[PDB]
Design a protein around this ligand. Sequence first.
Ligand SMILES: *[C@@H]1O[C@H](CO[C@@H]2O[C@@H](C)[C@@H](O)[C@@H](O)[C@@H]2O)[C@@H](O[C@@H]2O[C@H](CO)[C@@H](O)[C@H](O)[C@H]2NC(C)=O)[C@H](O[C@@H]2O[C@@H](C)[C@@H](O)[C@@H](O)[C@@H]2O)[C@H]1NC(C)=O
Ligand SMILES: *[C@@H]1O[C@H](CO)[C@@H](O[C@@H]2O[C@H](CO)[C@@H](O)[C@H](O)[C@H]2NC(C)=O)[C@H](O)[C@H]1NC(C)=O
Ligand SMILES: CC(=O)N[C@H]1[C@H]([C@H](O)[C@H](O)CO)O[C@@](O)(C(=O)O)C[C@@H]1O
Ligand SMILES: *[C@@H]1O[C@H](CO)[C@@H](O)[C@H](O)[C@H]1NC(C)=O
Ligand SMILES: *[C@@H]1O[C@H](CO)[C@@H](O)[C@H](O)[C@H]1NC(C)=O
Ligand SMILES: *[C@@H]1O[C@H](CO)[C@@H](O)[C@H](O)[C@H]1NC(C)=O
Ligand SMILES: *[C@@H]1O[C@H](CO)[C@@H](O)[C@H](O)[C@H]1NC(C)=O
Ligand SMILES: *[C@@H]1O[C@H](CO)[C@@H](O)[C@H](O)[C@H]1NC(C)=O
Ligand SMILES: *[C@@H]1O[C@H](CO)[C@@H](O)[C@H](O)[C@H]1NC(C)=O
Lengths: 49, 49, 278
Amino acid sequence: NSNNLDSKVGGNYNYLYRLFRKSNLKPFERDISTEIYQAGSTPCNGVEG
Amino acid sequence: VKNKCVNFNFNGLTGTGVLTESNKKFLPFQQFGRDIADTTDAVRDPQTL
Amino acid sequence: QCVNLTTRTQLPPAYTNSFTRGVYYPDKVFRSSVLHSTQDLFLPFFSNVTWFHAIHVSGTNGTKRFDNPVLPFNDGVYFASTEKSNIIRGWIFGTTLDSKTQSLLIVNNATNVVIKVCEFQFCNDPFLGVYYHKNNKSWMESEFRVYSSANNCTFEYVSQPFLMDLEGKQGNFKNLREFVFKNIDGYFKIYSKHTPINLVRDLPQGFSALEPLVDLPIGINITRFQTLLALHRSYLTPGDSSSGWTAGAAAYYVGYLQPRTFLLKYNENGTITDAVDC
Ligand SMILES: *[C@@H]1O[C@H](CO[C@@H]2O[C@@H](C)[C@@H](O)[C@@H](O)[C@@H]2O)[C@@H](O[C@@H]2O[C@H](CO)[C@@H](O)[C@H](O)[C@H]2NC(C)=O)[C@H](O[C@@H]2O[C@@H](C)[C@@H](O)[C@@H](O)[C@@H]2O)[C@H]1NC(C)=O
Ligand SMILES: *[C@@H]1O[C@H](CO)[C@@H](O[C@@H]2O[C@H](CO)[C@@H](O)[C@H](O)[C@H]2NC(C)=O)[C@H](O)[C@H]1NC(C)=O
Ligand SMILES: CC(=O)N[C@H]1[C@H]([C@H](O)[C@H](O)CO)O[C@@](O)(C(=O)O)C[C@@H]1O
Ligand SMILES: *[C@@H]1O[C@H](CO)[C@@H](O)[C@H](O)[C@H]1NC(C)=O
Ligand SMILES: *[C@@H]1O[C@H](CO)[C@@H](O)[C@H](O)[C@H]1NC(C)=O
Ligand SMILES: *[C@@H]1O[C@H](CO)[C@@H](O)[C@H](O)[C@H]1NC(C)=O
Ligand SMILES: *[C@@H]1O[C@H](CO)[C@@H](O)[C@H](O)[C@H]1NC(C)=O
Ligand SMILES: *[C@@H]1O[C@H](CO)[C@@H](O)[C@H](O)[C@H]1NC(C)=O
Ligand SMILES: *[C@@H]1O[C@H](CO)[C@@H](O)[C@H](O)[C@H]1NC(C)=O
């Protein structure tokens, strides 16, 4: 636990996690892309909505 | 200690046996030698190489 | 900085046979006078291997081949190179060879060996270029057009400086160098071997076990790879940097690894001298 170090009174938002990936990661694989994830049939054009 | 029945710990690999000078020429990426029975029958000394 | 090369004659792809090449040491355990059966990603014996050239044949039409296509990376690549003037300079591996994803670059800069896993906006025609000065009668590295931009660089390695003479040697291929590239569990496994050889046309016939070279902890997705070669410029071959170039004679052969069981023979000296593809 690192609550004494990684927590801020107003909220520490510097730590990020990946949600909405197309497929599961391979073992020891790193994905740092920031492309917009398309959940529906309508295709995105770099815009969130 | 050579030419004597000793317990040995070579780079974490423990065993019992007699260590003698070998004519085998290990490749630089090789540390242990194994026979047909997969037993460690040769070892490179981590200090004297 | 990206330059789109032109004046390349269109030729059908070439194919050849890999007889028994591509065998590498499965592990780092010494074995002598033994027949060891092991299952691994091996290049199948007598496999259909793609063949690429780099040559500028003098003539009216002739042939001006500079083959650096984007080839698949299915499970592992056997890459052989017959060269004499150090034309094959490296490779780039990735999925989408642009800034969207991360890519690996293993290149020879004629001074250092650079291995960078990072987000590269790779050029459509990436290459290197050596200029030949008539006054000095000397060859110097002058062009590096592999990528346009590099961002979010996670892995970097630069080797110790060297010389790597860039003279455009003429005659026979004096160097066969073989690599095996694998991408397993976030590790780029590179096995390498070098043999003198002396020929002009095809992939050498024989047996030579590849030794483990490096295990890069890159942790990236790789499905495609492109070979980076070096072209030649001098007082000859005038042009606008897209036609004013010539290709030094070189060739490289690409085969693909498959999960196979091989019976390897270790002689009394611990060297893999023969193999059987079961
Ligand atoms: C991955 O790359 C991002 C883009 O870097 C910027 O654009 C390049 C083309 C180049 O000009 C470079 O110098 C720029 O800095 C990094 O920056 C973030 O990009 C997002 C766009 O999706 C932007 O909203 C952020 O403001 C920007 N941050 C910074 C500090 O520039 C990424 O940096 C990390 O990821 C961000 C989501 C954010 O958490 C940032 O604080 C992080 O440092 C790069 N990601 C890595 C290196 O993991
Ligand atoms: C590694 O990269 C390949 C290619 O970029 C990914 O395969 C693609 O997967 C998407 C959906 O996941 C498909 O729409 C594409 O058609 C696929 N392309 C190819 C060439 O296969 C693969 O999913 C990636 N692997 C991981 C673990 O992310
Ligand atoms: C970069 C360059 O121009 N190389 C040219 C060489 C060089 O002049 C000599 O290798 C060094 O003097 O000479 C050629 O006739 C040759 O041998 O094929 C043509 C070739 O284009
Ligand atoms: C330490 O190990 C090295 C091998 O890397 C060896 O050359 C050297 O003699 C050793 N030193 C001692 C004091 O044993
Ligand atoms: C080279 O040609 C390709 C053709 O698809 C093009 O996409 C690319 O932009 C060109 N490069 C330059 C530098 O013009
Ligand atoms: C190798 O494959 C190509 C097409 O992929 C084919 O034309 C050629 O005949 C094949 N080689 C052999 C020896 O079958
Ligand atoms: C190649 O790159 C290395 C590091 O990026 C650099 O030190 C070296 O000078 C370069 N060599 C060239 C540009 O010929
Ligand atoms: C000749 O060599 C020197 C140093 O080796 C270099 O600075 C010079 O540019 C070369 N000549 C030409 C015409 O480039
Ligand atoms: C094994 O090595 C020795 C000495 O290095 C050499 O004399 C012998 O010919 C080698 N054996 C084989 C089969 O290469």
